[PDB]
Homo-oligomer: A and B are copies of this chain.
Amino acid sequence: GTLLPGQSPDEAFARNSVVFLVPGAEYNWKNVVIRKPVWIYGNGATVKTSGLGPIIHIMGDLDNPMDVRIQDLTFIGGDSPDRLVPFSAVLTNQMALWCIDPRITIRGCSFYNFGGAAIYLERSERDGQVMITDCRFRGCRIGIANGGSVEYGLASQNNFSDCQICFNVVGGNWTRSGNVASNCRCMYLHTQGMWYEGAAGNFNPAHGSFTSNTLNHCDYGGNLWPTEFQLPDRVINLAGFYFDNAAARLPNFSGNSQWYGDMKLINFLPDSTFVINGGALYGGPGDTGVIAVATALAAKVFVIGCQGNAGQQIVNVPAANIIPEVGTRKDDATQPAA
């Protein structure tokens, strides 16, 4: 199972349970199809592409115990992004890994300059143990997009730099821990009518775990991507952490650092509360790194065990729910805007 540059990756994956790339070599792949579980040992190779993606389309089989596994592999989606081009349906095609019904492990890989999601995971029908760790993302529209009913995955110890949206979140119950983002407009996005919902749609969404993450310089002092983001049927204004869905609950949120990590809690299920727990909230001067909740749900939001500076604004959360005192608190019913 040794796959040379120029040989058909499709043939090699069909013929072998495990494939080893030539160490450090350069590949050029386009619309590869994986139909049964295969392990790839990338050996520090690089996979380039051109034209409409994805680079690999992975047809899953959740009954089969053997996962698809990709280790130690670089994927390049092309040159540096034009970050001003509006996102579109045709650009959603520009993926590294499009995975349906995924039982998959992605470890120690790098993803550079994808026009859409570097990694997209969807479910063919509504109802895996997915793991994405130690990966690097640079210059990508979206880092990892999990569609509805892709649940209970783990994305941890990954580094995101210069990505518009790190986690395009739909499917529920993922653990996202120990991840670093800098100069990314959005680390966490969840709302209705997203891209990359997949065949199960926007079902049992979000409500997972977001711990020990850093989202720095989202809205100020490094990020280059636009705030305004085109969904399929409306335009929104992203934030480092953006949540707008009255029919969904937020994830558990503890141990995270926000240095210009602006946050907008626009709407969530009324039978819930939310805590910004054990966090570091630094912002200012001016309206930079602002944290804001919908006035109608502010009594259900708390800021507990947080540290911060005077310049960090907290908008609409009542004073009684901020223990201990952190930043500067105010009421402004114009915030947060969608």
User: A: which residues have CB within 8 A of B?
Assistant: 1, 16-18, 20, 23-24, 39, 43-44, 46, 65-67, 69, 72, 74, 105, 107-108, 110, 112, 129, 131, 133-134, 136, 138, 152-154, 156-157, 159, 161, 173, 175, 177-178, 180, 182, 207-209, 211-214, 216, 249-252, 254-257, 259, 271-275, 277-280, 282, 302, 304-311, 321, 323-324, 326
15 contacts between A and B (CB under 8 A): A17-B44, A105-B108, A105-B134, A129-B138, A152-B161, A152-B216, A175-B180, A175-B213, A209-B255, A209-B257, A251-B280, A254-B305, A271-B310, A275-B324, A302-B307
Q: Which residues of B contact A24 (CB under 8 A)?
A: 1, 16-18, 39
Q: Do A65 and B112 touch across chains, with their CB atoms under 8 A apart?
A: yes
Q: Do B214 and A173 touch across chains, with their CB atoms under 8 A apart?
A: yes
Q: Do B280 and A278 touch across chains, with their CB atoms under 8 A apart?
A: no
Closest chain B CB from A149 CB (angstroms): 13
Q: Of B66, B69, B207, B307, which contacts A275 at CB under 8 A?
A: B307
User: In the complex this chain forms, how many copies of it are found?
Assistant: 3
Q: Of B131, B209, B216, which contacts A280 at CB under 8 A?
A: B209
Q: Of B254, B257, B274, B311, which contacts A255 at CB under 8 A?
A: B254
Q: Which residues of B contact A133 (CB under 8 A)?
A: 134, 157
Q: Of B17, B18, B214, which contacts A209 at CB under 8 A?
A: B214
Q: Do B17 and A275 touch across chains, with their CB atoms under 8 A apart?
A: no
Known contacts A209-B257, A252-B278, A305-B305: does B23 contact A1 (CB below 8 Å)?
Answer: yes
**Nearest B residue to A18, CB-CB:** B23
Known contacts A152-B182, A173-B216, A275-B324: does B309 contact A280 (CB below 8 Å)?
Answer: no
Q: Which residues of B contact A105 (CB under 8 A)?
A: 108, 134
In Å, the complex CA distance between A16 and B23 comes to 9
Q: Do A44 and B18 touch across chains, with their CB atoms under 8 A apart?
A: yes
Q: Do A309 and B271 touch across chains, with their CB atoms under 8 A apart?
A: yes
In Å, the complex CA distance between A129 and B259 comes to 17
Q: Which residues of B contact A321 (CB under 8 A)?
A: 324
Q: Which residues of B contact A20 (CB under 8 A)?
A: 23
Q: Which residues of B contact A180 (CB under 8 A)?
A: 129, 152-154, 175
In Å, the complex CA distance between A254 and B209 comes to 12
Q: Which residues of B contact A311 (CB under 8 A)?
A: 271
